[PDB]
Design a protein around this ligand. Sequence first.
Ligand SMILES: Cc1cn([C@H]2C[C@H](O)[C@@H](COP(=O)(O)O)O2)c(=O)[nH]c1=O
Ligand SMILES: Cc1cn([C@H]2C[C@H](O)[C@@H](COP(=O)(O)O)O2)c(=O)[nH]c1=O
Ligand SMILES: [Mg+2]
Ligand SMILES: [Mg+2]
Ligand SMILES: [Mg+2]
Ligand SMILES: [Mg+2]
Lengths: 194, 194
Amino acid sequence: RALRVLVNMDGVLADFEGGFLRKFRARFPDQPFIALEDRRGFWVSEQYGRLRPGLSEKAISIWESKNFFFELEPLPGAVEAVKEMASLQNTDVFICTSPIKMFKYCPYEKYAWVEKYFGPDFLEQIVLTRDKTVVSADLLIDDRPDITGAEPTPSWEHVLFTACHNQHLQLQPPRRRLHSWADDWKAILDSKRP
Amino acid sequence: RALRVLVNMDGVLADFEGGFLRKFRARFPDQPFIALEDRRGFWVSEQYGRLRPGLSEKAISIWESKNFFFELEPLPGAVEAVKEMASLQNTDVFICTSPIKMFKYCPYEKYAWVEKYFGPDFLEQIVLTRDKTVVSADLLIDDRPDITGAEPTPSWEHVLFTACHNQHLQLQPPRRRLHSWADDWKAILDSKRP
Ligand SMILES: Cc1cn([C@H]2C[C@H](O)[C@@H](COP(=O)(O)O)O2)c(=O)[nH]c1=O
Ligand SMILES: Cc1cn([C@H]2C[C@H](O)[C@@H](COP(=O)(O)O)O2)c(=O)[nH]c1=O
Ligand SMILES: [Mg+2]
Ligand SMILES: [Mg+2]
Ligand SMILES: [Mg+2]
Ligand SMILES: [Mg+2]
């Protein structure tokens, strides 16, 4: 009976794109890179591998490194918005996030990051999964255009969170965006309430 | 269109009760303990705290310790059964597990344990969450009697996996058990298929 909202972590709460670019340039100063304006498509590794041989593996090495996830900066407005959202009557918020294959640091640091920005009690709201379609809710706010998995008819409406890699994408109606946390997220939530 | 089954980790795949008792007795040999036959109720910490002052905190210290989760032994038949189950046509298996509050080791070691017993490709099937009711499926096989959360009407049927702490519990019809992995799990799955 409470509206349930899944909020994606990387590219929505945490600035994966910015953190990755900064750390890639610092580690690999002699390699070419993709400026954020020129990012296209969800997969960083795939765009970097097209740029040249061996860059896909070098990109992956950034996010496999210790401290990568933990040191991501929150996207503007994200912490404030999600705190407000969670505090709303008849509204339950979960943070829904996919870990990488290499599991040494990523799960741990994601829990640490949520504690850092939202406090210990918000840890109970984390769902770590590679398949978001088996998580049920009214809304999923997520920067990845193509969200698929084991469930062919997910219960949520996917609202596309704007990111550098998707900002030029024309969606099929009635697919809808949340343009940033400065955009009117309350209106989107209210549109799904009884 | 594929039957989806959530399989709980602790108390179903991994022998939490046995591992905990062994490590508690080794660390705290001068303290009283609860033999598995005498376990009642999901919460170990709560039964130990009733046994005496300070034992709840000493129990918690076992599973907060490094290597606790990783070193759990699989329950008899569990690895074999889940491998077979996953390989069945029109059947998708996810491992659905709740982490502790202290996140330094538990998420990491749970991923490590799944890799160890099921292989790298099975990592994609893990769902870490404190709330199982927001995970949608046809079945949930889980040793905890009371499974509640944000979703008042979960999409799964909860089948109670027998454990020392629940073996004496009379369930309200039509609630049903899977008595061990030697019991006929295929019959339970088939009962939910079209
Ligand atoms: C951009 C990118 C992210 N990832 C991982 C990083 C995060 O663990 C996961 C985040 O996905 P999500 O934002 O859909 O939850 O995707 C890759 O493995 N390769 C990539 O190219
Ligand atoms: C028995 C017990 C388990 N736990 C934790 C251990 C596991 O992380 C989690 C397993 O729960 P689950 O088997 O329902 O997924 O419960 C406690 O925090 N206190 C306890 O007394
Ligand atoms: Mg994302
Ligand atoms: Mg609320
Ligand atoms: Mg369990
Ligand atoms: Mg299968």
